[model samples]
Target: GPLGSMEDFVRQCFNPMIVELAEKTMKEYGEDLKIETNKFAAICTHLEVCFMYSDASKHRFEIIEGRDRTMAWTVVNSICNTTGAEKPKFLPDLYDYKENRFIEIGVTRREVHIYYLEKANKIKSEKTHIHIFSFTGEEMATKADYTLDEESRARIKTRLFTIRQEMASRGLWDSFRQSER
Candidate 1:
C-alpha cells in the first residue's frame, strides 16, 4: 500500500519490550549504533535512519508531541553526544549543490554526488532530500519536520499536505515504510 498519510506510522504501536530487546543489539557505526544481527527490531533499518536522524536534527517534533522517542533518541542521542552532529558532517552527503539534486540516504552511503558541474555522470537523484530530515516522530515522518520558523515551517506544511496527492508523481519521496520488517 502507499504511504496514505504521515500519520500512518503514528497509528502503529510497538511493544515496549520491542525497544528493550532491540536497543541492546545495536552496534556502533561511525557514531551511532548499527543493527548488528537481529533483523527483527534493530533501528536504522532503512530510510528510517534518515527519518530517525532528521527527527533529532531540525524537527524535534517527536520530543514535542510526547511520542515514543526511545528508539529514535537512542540512536540520535548516541550520535549527537559525539562530534559528528554538526552540519556539513552529519549528512553532508545528502544534497548535490550544483546538480540541483539530492542523493538517496537510507542506511548506507553510495555514489559520488557533488556540486557545481556543467553536466553529471550518473542519473541525478532529484529528491527533496534537503527536507527529508525535516520531519519525524511516528506521526510527522510522512510529512514535514515542522521547524520553528513560520515561513519554513509553512513551506513544509504544503509539502506535507501534498504527500498523498503526488504518490502518482513519485521518485525519491518514498516513505520509510518500516513495518513488516
Candidate 2:
C-alpha cells in the first residue's frame, strides 16, 4: 500500500540533492577542506531520522522535500560552482557479484546493514537477508547497538509529529495538499 506520505520521495530524490548541494557548497567555501561523502551521507540520514521522530507530523512530507530541494540547489549555485574542487567520493560499497569483488571503503558494517534494511523495507519484503556470511567473520558480524530504545523511539516519533503540526498550522501543509489535488 502507498504510505500516503511523501517520506519516500524525499528520501530517494531530495536527500541526494541536499547532499550534492552541501558538497558543492563545501568545495566553494572551503577549498582546502576535504568533504567526506560518508560523513555527508551520515549527516543526511541523521537529519531524516530526527525529522521522523519530531512532534509535528502533518507537513513533514512536504517540508522535508522542499527543504532538501531548496537547500540542494542553493548549495550548488552558491558553494560548489565557486569552488574548484571535484565531487566528493560518495559511492556506496556493495557486493559486486559480476566482478567477484568486495568494494570496501569508509562505509562501516552498520551503515551497510541499515541501508539494506531500509531498501528491503521500502520494497515491502518480509525478510531481510544479510549476506555477510559470504565475507570474513568480522565482516559478517552485526553491530549490537543498532536498535533504538523505547524512549528514543518515542522522542523521534514525537518530533516528527510536532514538525507536521507546525507545518500544518503555518498553512504549508494545505498548500502542498492543494497542489497534489
Candidate 3:
C-alpha cells in the first residue's frame, strides 16, 4: 500500500477525462480549471493542468526528471485554488522577513495552513519543528471558481521552480517527502 515515487502516484490516480477537461479550458478559455475533488486525484489533475497551460512537449520529463519539484507546487497551488478564498493569492516567497523564520504552507482536505518552521536562521535551529500558524483561508463549503488571470497563470507556472530554488537555497526542501499529502 506504500507509494514508491511521484510517477507511481500519478500512475495509480491518472484520469484522462479530467486532463482532457483541463486542456479544453486552458486552450479555449485561458483559465486552468479546478477539477480534482480528492487528494488521490489531485496530483494527476494538477500535473495535467501544468501540461496544458505550459509546454506539453516536455511533459514526459516534467513528471520524471522534475518529479517532486513539479508535484509540490501543482498540489499546493491547486489546493489554494479550490479550497481557499475566492481569489487564491500565493506568496511569492515563503520567508517571513520580520519574524526571521520561514513559513511552510501545508494543506489538508478542507484547510490550508501556514506553519512557522522552528528551523529558523536557515540553520535548522536546535530541533526542527513546524509550529502551526493561523490558516491562510477558511475552507469553502463548495469549491471556488478558480479562474486564473493572465498574470496568475504565469505566476503559478513559475511557482514550482521559484519555491524549489528558494527552499533549496535555505536548505529546507531536500528533506521534503512527496507522498506526505
Candidate 4:
C-alpha cells in the first residue's frame, strides 16, 4: 500500500536525489563518500532547513507531489536554487561520496526499516545495511549485512530464526511450514 505522507515523500524523493548528487560528485572527484543512514539523515536535514529558508513552502505541494508527482531532480533543483544562507557545495554536501541504491522500506505500526546497498570498489561485492527507527525518529539502530555468503550467511540465518519466533507466536509459521511439508 502507498503510505502517502510528508515523510514518505522525503524518503521516496529527496533521499534518492541526494544519492544522485553523491553519485555525480563521486565520478567527478574520484572519491567514495557512499550513502549511509546518518549521512542519509544529514541530507534530509539539509533539505528540511533549506525548505524552511526558502519561499518554496509557497510551492510545497508541487515540490512534494501533494498534487500528483514531481520529478526528483526538479525538486532538487528548486531546493538548491532557491535556498538562502546555506547551499549544497557538492563536496561538503557530498560528505567526502554506486551500483549504490536505496532498496527497501518496511513500515510497521511500531517501527520502520530501511535497506540500502552500496557496491564495493572491488567488483562483485556489495554491502547491505538495515536501519530501524520509530516513525517519529525518536529511537534508531543499524546493523550491517553483506551481500555474500561467509559472514553474511551466518548473520542472515540468525535473523531468520528471530523472525520465525515472532511469526510462530502469530500462528503464521505453521501455515508456511505446512505448505512446504
Give the runs in model 3 whose Cα sits over 4 Å from its true position: 1-37, 56-109, 115-181
- Give the per-residue lDDT of model 2 (tens digit) for 1-181: 1222333322443357555544554455553223243233333434444343232343221122213445544543343255442322321122222222222211122334554444444434222122211111122212332133456555544544444454355443443333311
Winner by TM-score: 2
Where model 2 places Cα greater than 4 Å from the true spot, the runs are 1-118, 121-146, 175-181
- Displacement of the residue 129 alpha carbon in candidate 2, Å: 9.1
Descending-lDDT candidate ranking: 2, 3, 4, 1
- Superposed by TM-score, candidate 3 places the C-alpha of residue 161 at a distance from the truth, in angstroms, of 23
lDDT of 4 by residue, 38-128 (tens): 2333334334323222222242222231111234434434544654213322111110001122211211223233212211221231222
Q: Lowest summed-lDDT stretch of 10 residues in model 3? A: 133-142
Q: Give the alpha carbon lDDT tens digit for every residue of 1-181 in model 3.
A: 2223332333434456644443443545444333222233333344443444334233221221113334546644553465452211322113222222222222222222311222233434322122221112222111232222345444443543443344345443333323234
Per-candidate TM vs. native? 0.20, 0.27, 0.21, 0.21
Among all candidates shown, the one with the greatest lDDT? 2
Q: 3 or 4: which has the higher lDDT?
A: 3
The CA-based lDDT of model 2 is what? 0.34
Against the reference, the lDDT scores of all candidates come to: 0.30, 0.34, 0.33, 0.31
Spell out the clash pairs found in candidate 1.
Answer: 27-34, 98-116, 134-145, 135-145
- Per residue, candidate 1 scores C-alpha lDDT tens digits across 59-147 of 33222111234544454444445534432212222332233323333221111122112112132322323232222211221124322
